[PDB]
């Protein structure tokens, strides 16, 4: 069992926090908010670093480049912006979607960015030029998540339309649609570190682990509350192997990857825990909450 325990609470955002992510080097934490803002924090001490301004409306997601130098964010302002982190410069503004941008991510090479929007589509952008390379007609409802795999060859996407689809990055061809038995709106999706599996959150208070090839649901993780918000989830693999995920009952849930039972429930937040993230190398988890709470928390573990 893990022993995660509160080490830091980070106040700053004046509106709901939407997403946190650890820089790839494990030095920084990045956060985005309904307050149109991004904030940087020291990954180990929670020491506030800087603030990054620019979006005209709130932000739903943010994501690090592979070298921890750039950031991309997805805003209700129908755009994405790319940022030099240490300079705080807005390098590019990606225009294209016809409604809110909801999720975003770099490919491992980080010459690419994938995004997802309420307009029901998925776009692939060029980092260097801000140009929309491809526009996949991905879903028939808003898009809740997008993620590259270990080598940038594949993108996974999810939607309120019930579906998780896998796409070939090069061609933009849909290689796979994942169908369960009931198909509740799909609110989050993410590859395993090795790309072999897929972890998917779904508004029936369920998380499922899928084998991407065979296209079959393997594990199921429940116990939490998730029926309204798109809550991030994670594979924790720095110590033991767990599944971490926010929850709408204000707690951070932890599951044993294999047996699929709750091995820990973190207490602290006072509103929906909307996002979680697991440090690159250390057993550190970052958590963040909605309008009524607005803080970010870091918990550490020995296991």
């Amino acid at each position: 069992k893990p022993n995660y325990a509160l080490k830091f609470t980070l106040a700053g955002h004046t509106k709901a926090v939407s997403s946190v992510k650890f820089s790839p080097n494990g030095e920084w934490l990045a956060s985005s908010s309904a307050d149109k803002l991004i904030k940087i924090w020291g990954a180990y001490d929670g020491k506030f670093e800087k603030t990054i301004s620019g979006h005209k409306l709130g932000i739903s997601d943010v994501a690090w480049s592979s070298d921890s130098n750039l950031l991309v964010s997805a805003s209700d302002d129908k755009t994405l912006k790319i940022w030099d982190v240490s300079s705080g410069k807005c390098l590019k503004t990606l225009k294209g979607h016809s409604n809110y941008v909801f999720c975003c991510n770099f490919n491992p090479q980080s010459n690419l960015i994938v995004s997802g929007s309420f307009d029901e589509s998925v776009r692939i952008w060029d980092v260097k030029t801000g140009k929309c390379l491809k526009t996949l007609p991905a879903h028939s409802d808003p898009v809740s998540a997008v993620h590259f795999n270990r080598d940038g060859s594949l993108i996974v996407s999810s939607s309120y339309d019930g579906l998780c689809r896998i796409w070939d990055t090069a061609s933009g061809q849909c290689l796979k649609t994942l169908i369960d038995d009931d198909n509740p709106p799909v609110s989050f999706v993410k590859f395993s570190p090795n790309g072999k599996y897929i972890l998917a959150a779904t508004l029936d208070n369920t998380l499922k682990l899928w084998d991407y090839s065979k296209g079959k649901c393997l594990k199921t993780y429940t116990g939490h509350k998730n029926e309204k918000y798109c809550i991030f989830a994670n594979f924790s693999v720095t110590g033991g192997k767990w599944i971490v995920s926010g929850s709408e009952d204000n707690l951070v849930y932890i599951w044993n990857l294999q047996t699929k039972e709750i091995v820990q429930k973190l207490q602290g937040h006072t509103d929906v825990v909307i996002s979680t993230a697991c440090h690159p190398t250390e057993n550190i988890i970052a958590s963040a909450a909605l309008e009524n709470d607005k803080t970010i928390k870091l918990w550490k573990s020995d296991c």
């Binding site: 926090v17 939407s18 918000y229 909307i274």
Partner: peptide
Amino acid sequence: ARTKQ
């Protein structure tokens, strides 16, 4: 946004 509903 992701925080409204």
